[PDB]
Design a protein around this ligand. Structure first.
Ligand SMILES: NCCc1c[nH]c2ccc(Cl)cc12
Ligand SMILES: [Ca+2]
Length: 223
C-alpha cells in the first residue's frame, strides 16, 4: 500500500496473509473455512495466516491453517486478468472472534464514488521498494467506469473496476495482490492489477466481486 496508513493491529479482522514460506498475497476470510483471493495468486502449498498484524513476529492472535484446496475461477484468463478470483478452503475451520472475523459478500454492486478500505502488506513505495511488516490501509473511492476505461484503453472488462486517485500517490502495490477492497462492510473488490503503483492517471484495478457471488456461494455449497 502506497500513501496509506498503519491500520492498527487486528483492526481489519478479515484480512489474511497467504504464506508459502513467506508472505506472497493477501486474501479475505468470508466464512470459517473459506478465503477469497486473486486467481493470479494461485500456487500449491498455501498456508493461510489469520489474525496477523506484524507478519514477521508472532504477536498472539494468529491462526495458521493450511489450505486443503484452491479453486481458480473457471474463466480466469491470466493474460487479460479477466475473472481474477480464486477460492481457498482451509483444512480446519478458523476460530472466529473479534480479531479473526469474516467479511460479508455484497448483495449489490457498489457505485462509483463509494468510499472503500484497501489493505495489505505490499510495497509502500511508488518508486523503490520497502515492505512493511505491519498491515497498511488506504481509504479510496471507486472511480467511474468511463474514467477507468480511459485510464486503461482496451483492458477494462465488466469484471473489473478502478479505485484510487488519478493524481497518483495512493494505491495498492506489489504484495497487496489478492487482498480486500471493502465498502460499507461488504467485500466489493480484490487487488488485481495496474500499471506500476500510485502512478498518475493509472489507478488500481480490482476484481468486481459482486459479479461472482453466485459462483462463490454455489462453489462453497458443494466443496
Ligand atoms: N494497484 C496494485 C496492482 C498490483 C498488483 N500486483 C502488482 C505487482 C506489481 C505492481 Cl507494479 C502492481 C501490482
Ligand atoms: Ca504475526
Amino acid at each position: 500500500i502506497v500513501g496509506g496508513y498503519t491500520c492498527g493491529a487486528n483492526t481489519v479482522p478479515y484480512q489474511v496473509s497467504l504464506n508459502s514460506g513467506y508472505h506472497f498475497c493477501g486474501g479475505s476470510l468470508i466464512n470459517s473455512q473459506w478465503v477469497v483471493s486473486a486467481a493470479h495468486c494461485y500456487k500449491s502449498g498455501i498456508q493461510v495466516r489469520l489474525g496477523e498484524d506484524n507478519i514477521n513476529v508472532v504477536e498472539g492472535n494468529e491462526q495458521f491453517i493450511s489450505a486443503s484446496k484452491s479453486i481458480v475461477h473457471p474463466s480466469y484468463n491470466s493474460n487479460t486478468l479477466n475473472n481474477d478470483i480464486m477460492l481457498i478452503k482451509l483444512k480446519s475451520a478458523a476460530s472466529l472472534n473479534s480479531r479473526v472475523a469474516s467479511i460479508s459478500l455484497p448483495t449489490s454492486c457498489a457505485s462509483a464514488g463509494t468510499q472503500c478500505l484497501i489493505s495489505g502488506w505490499g510495497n509502500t513505495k511508488s518508486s523503490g521498494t520497502s515492505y512493511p511488516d505491519v498491515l497498511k490501509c488506504l481509504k479510496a473511492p471507486i472511480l467511474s467506469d468511463s474514467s477507468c476505461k480511459s485510464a486503461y484503453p482496451g483492458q477494462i472488462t465488466s469484471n473489473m473496476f478502478c479505485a484510487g486517485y488519478l493524481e497518483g500517490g495512493k494505491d495498492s502495490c506489489q504484495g497487496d495482490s489478492g487482498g480486500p477492497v471493502v465498502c460499507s462492510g461488504k467485500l466489493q473488490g480484490i487487488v488485481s492489477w495496474g500499471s506500476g503503483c500510485a502512478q498518475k492517471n493509472k489507478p488500481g484495478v480490482y476484481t468486481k466481486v459482486c459479479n461472482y457471488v453466485s459462483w462463490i456461494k454455489q462453489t462453497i455449497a458443494s466443496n
